[PDB]
Amino acid sequence: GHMATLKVIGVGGGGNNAVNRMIDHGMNNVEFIAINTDGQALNLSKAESKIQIGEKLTRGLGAGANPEIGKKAAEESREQIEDAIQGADMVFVTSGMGGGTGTGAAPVVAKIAKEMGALTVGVVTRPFSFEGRKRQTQAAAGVEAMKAAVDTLIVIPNDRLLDIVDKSTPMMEAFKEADNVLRQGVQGISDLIAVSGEVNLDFADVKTIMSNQGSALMGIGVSSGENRAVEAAKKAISSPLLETSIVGAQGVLMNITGGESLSLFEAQEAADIVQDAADEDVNMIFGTVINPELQDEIVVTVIATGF
Ligand SMILES: Nc1nc2c(ncn2[C@@H]2O[C@H](COP(=O)(O)OP(=O)(O)O)[C@@H](O)[C@H]2O)c(=O)[nH]1
Ligand SMILES: NC(=O)c1c(F)ccc(OCc2cccc(Cl)c2)c1F
Ligand SMILES: [K+]
To answer: Where does GTP bind?
Structure first.
């Protein structure tokens, strides 16, 4: 009876916004931690655990867009960060790259989590092009530092949100689409840990696919009716919001959930959709859950890594 301990850690403004909106949803058995220099924003966090970093350095303000201040702030507070991560088996570090606190502190937070043996996944945004080339260059250095500090990294270029809005779509509605990348990845692992599958996968399979593996994709597809299996598999690997596509994937963890009508043939169809993109020598871990509460709906979930 192994019950993996998951923690989601927001770092900086954007990261903690995403955590707050996640908490507004129904997320149980995940621990949320909020880390910021900005005391004003931190006080409005909904997370159980709040860590104000760098208070001596910033006097309670943010980092003023200076990543070196974010980095020093996280180092000043290393012990408080260690204490908050204690017990974690898996840590999601979420942050908006390009500012001061996220860019600088998020790699330190991820390094501490990995030092403590936790499976460490980064979920970060790149700035909009309209924020300017300098912010983009600063964010790019953050991404590289995250790569060197995490097991696996998911990068969401904010420019991709401009591909899914019309001219009137509210900004907050667009942000919720980016939030969903994190929410569905965390919820997917939670489901995998809690549910016993007819072909059962568990946290050790997640570790094999995600430990020290670079870029990652975490997707989910839901469909019904004819060709449901193919359509759900296509949805799970085709997010318009990710920087890393599934082409060339060297590891894949894949699960299909459906009712008692789930057929062997459609399991093959869904797996073939994913294989046709991945490397021919991909390490594929395939699972299946039969949820008789379901009727015609089928859910395909995919973790892809190794490029
Ligand atoms: N998608 C999304 N991006 C955000 C959000 N908040 C900030 N960003 C992006 O994150 C970058 C860093 O901003 P922020 O996190 O506030 O800076 P920091 O607190 O100094 O780390 C910005 O340049 C934006 O590109 C948010 O709520 N959603
Ligand atoms: N076969 C299982 O034990 C199982 C289960 F009983 C529930 C969920 C599972 O996978 C969820 C998942 C997979 C890939 C990506 C993501 Cl995000 C989520 C499973 F593999
Ligand atoms: K399971």
So the answer is: 13-17, 100-102, 131, 135, 179
Residues in contact with ligand 2 by the CB-under-6-Å rule are 184-185, 188, 191-192, 195, 197, 199-201, 218, 220, 253, 255, 287-289, 301-303
Retrieve residue 161's tokens.
């949100």
| Tally: H helices and E strands in the chain | 11, 10
Instruction: Give the contacts of 298 (CB within 8 A, at least 6 positions apart).
Output: 222, 223, 224, 228, 229, 232, 256, 257, 258, 262, 266
Q: How far apart are CA 153 and CA 204, in angstroms?
A: 19
Q: Whose CA is nearest to atom 16 of ligand 2?
A: 188
For residue 305, give both structure tokens: 């890594």
Q: What is the DSSP string of 93-122?
A: EEEETTSSHHHHHHHHHHHHHHHTT-EEEE
d(CA 229, CA 9): 34
Residue given tokens 């996280």 in the structure block:
74
3-class SS of residue 214:
strand
Experimental method reported for this structure: X-ray
Resolution for the entry shown, Å? 1.5
Q: Is 179 annotated as a binding residue?
A: yes
